[PDB]
């Protein structure tokens, strides 16, 4: 029920977001990594894997491409490059415009509630 | 930036939920997608191929292959409509009982009422497909 509702909600969101990702030729997972490194200051490999919800064997390859593309750099801690910061703001702007279009219909109040409930649900491992 | 990520928020919520369900599904030879099909076939009784694909969010070629496996195991049968077998009904009730036990554990923490609201809000967010 909730499992399925989650996938149905994100899938409907993803179909309209996928054309955007192809214009920068970045994948979903790459975008999550890019955004997380921006919304956080810096993140190590394990923490990045946990928050991006990417398996450790998969994350290494993805990170390598982002560094070859000069978007992410290793120092083990990871952080966006100057260019990575710019890419995040441009794509993020389109997403905010997308967020605004949904909030205009769904309702600002319902939208805020959805954010809180999704955040609490993610946190329920430590709380169990 | 301005507003939080819905993309990331959605996937983080589900991963934490799947973490509580994977040990149950792995003790049986069931995958996430297979379980999704089994529940949908149970809540509707019977579903045709296209309708099943849309609700389980599984691509038609992939759905076909999974269905072939579920029939080899004698859990699903074609009639084009799909339905659980008698044993399929048994597996759903058996696995479902273990799954329900985890929902109760989560709801004790998240809140029984809030859990219900989240389903509604996700459906509304989902219906604004456009």
Residue numbers in the entry:
A (entry chain D): 9 to 83, 92 to 144
B (entry chain C): 5 to 83, 92 to 142
Recite the paper's sentences.
However, it was eventually possible to crystallize apo-NadR, and the structure was determined at 2.7 Å resolution by MR methods using the NadR/4-HPA complex as the search model. The apo-NadR crystal structure contained two homodimers in the asymmetric unit (chains A+B and chains C+D). In the apo-NadR crystals, the two homodimers were related by a rotation of ~90°; the observed association of the two dimers was presumably merely an effect of crystal packing, since the interface between the two homodimers is small (< 550 Å2 of buried surface area), and is not predicted to be physiologically relevant by the PISA software. Subsequently, analyses of the pockets in apo-NadR revealed that in the absence of ligand the long Arg43 side chain was always in the open ‘outward’ position compatible with binding to the 4-HPA carboxylate group. This was also evident in the greater disorder (i.e. less well-defined electron density) in the β1-β2 loops of the apo dimers (density for 16 residues per dimer was missing) compared to the holo dimer (density for only 3 residues was missing). Assuming the same DNA-binding mechanism is used by OhrR and NadR, the apo-homodimer AB seems ideally pre-configured for DNA binding, while 4-HPA appeared to stabilize holo-NadR in a conformation poorly suited for DNA binding. Overall, these analyses suggest that the apo-NadR dimer has a pre-existing equilibrium that samples a variety of conformations, some of which are compatible with DNA binding.
NadR belongs to the MarR (Multiple Antibiotic Resistance Regulator) family, a group of ligand-responsive transcriptional regulators ubiquitous in bacteria and archaea. In the presence of 4-hydroxyphenylacetate (4-HPA), a catabolite present in human saliva both under physiological conditions and during bacterial infection, the binding of NadR to the nadA promoter is attenuated and nadA expression is induced. Each NadR monomer consists of six α-helices and two short β-strands, with helices α1, α5, and α6 forming the dimer interface.
